[PDB]
Write a structure and sequence with these properties.
Three copies of one chain form a homotrimer. Chain A is mostly helical. Chain A has one domain (1-72): Single alpha-helices involved in coiled-coils or other helix-helix interfaces (Up-down Bundle). Helices cover 79% and strands 0% of the residues of chain A. Chain A has helices spanning 2-22, 33-68. In chain A, helix 1 packs antiparallel against helix 2 (33-68). The longest helix of chain A is centred in the C-terminal third of the chain and has 36 residues, at 33-68. Chain A is rod-shaped, with a radius of gyration of 19 Å. The interface between B and C is medium-sized, with 31 and 34 residues. Bound molecules: the ligand COc1ccc(-c2ccc(CN(C(=O)c3cc(C(=O)O)c(C(=O)O)cc3C(=O)O)[C@H]3CCCc4ccccc43)cc2)cc1. The ligand COc1ccc(-c2ccc(CN(C(=O)c3cc(C(=O)O)c(C(=O)O)cc3C(=O)O)[C@H]3CCCc4ccccc43)cc2)cc1 sits between chains A (1-3, 58, 61-62, 65) and C (56, 60, 63-64).
Chain lengths: 72, 72, 72
Amino acid sequence: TSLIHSLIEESQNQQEKNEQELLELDGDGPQLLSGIVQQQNNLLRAIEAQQHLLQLTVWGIKQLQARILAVE
Amino acid sequence: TSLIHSLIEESQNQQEKNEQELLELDGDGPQLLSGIVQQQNNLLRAIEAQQHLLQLTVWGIKQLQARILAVE
Amino acid sequence: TSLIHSLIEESQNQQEKNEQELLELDGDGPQLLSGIVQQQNNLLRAIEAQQHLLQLTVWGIKQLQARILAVE
Ligand SMILES: COc1ccc(-c2ccc(CN(C(=O)c3cc(C(=O)O)c(C(=O)O)cc3C(=O)O)[C@H]3CCCc4ccccc43)cc2)cc1
């Protein structure tokens, strides 16, 4: 939730900067760089999707505690 | 659920591609890249591990929201 | 160390390897690589922060379950 979106905001922008630098370095170094940014993109996309799953559970318990508080 | 698995599968696929391409430059060249690849290999295994742990905490939201109907 | 923290620990130990490799090879490679070394640490930090939220939800579920089981 909250902190994860702020760390996403910083990390995504820095990953997009590495993709920008790849689109300015198109063979100016190892071909691996077009695979490294693409790996970091796929790793980032897992964190970006976890932002919803690790929100469903987290707001899950913050709703469920208020249902328990109707009888506790 | 089906989405996070696709992102993990794609990150696993692209890690297998990145490690294979690192093997293709057999010896010297960038050097530094032999640490970059192994970072994302460890990040991939760590993202896998918390995506496995995700299921157990998701099953606990399912268990809680079901058994709250036995509290009253 | 659970499962999770061993991969994060070996990733963390790899950042010290990748930073000393970047400090040694500071005058060779694509400029992209000096942004990757920092951005993959922001990915590690996001994985660790998400792991701390996985700890918070699975703790949360036990604290909710202790209250649900006192009335069910
Ligand atoms: C009685 O049972 C429980 C009550 C509350 C919680 C619970 C769950 C998660 C959080 C974490 N959290 C939230 O989930 C959160 C809490 C609130 C709120 O309670 O005021 C709000 C809000 O209502 O705006 C928004 C968030 C969020 O991140 O989306 C924030 C606030 C604390 C600092 C922090 C650090 C890193 C990431 C997130 C968080 C805390 C307690 C668990 C069991």
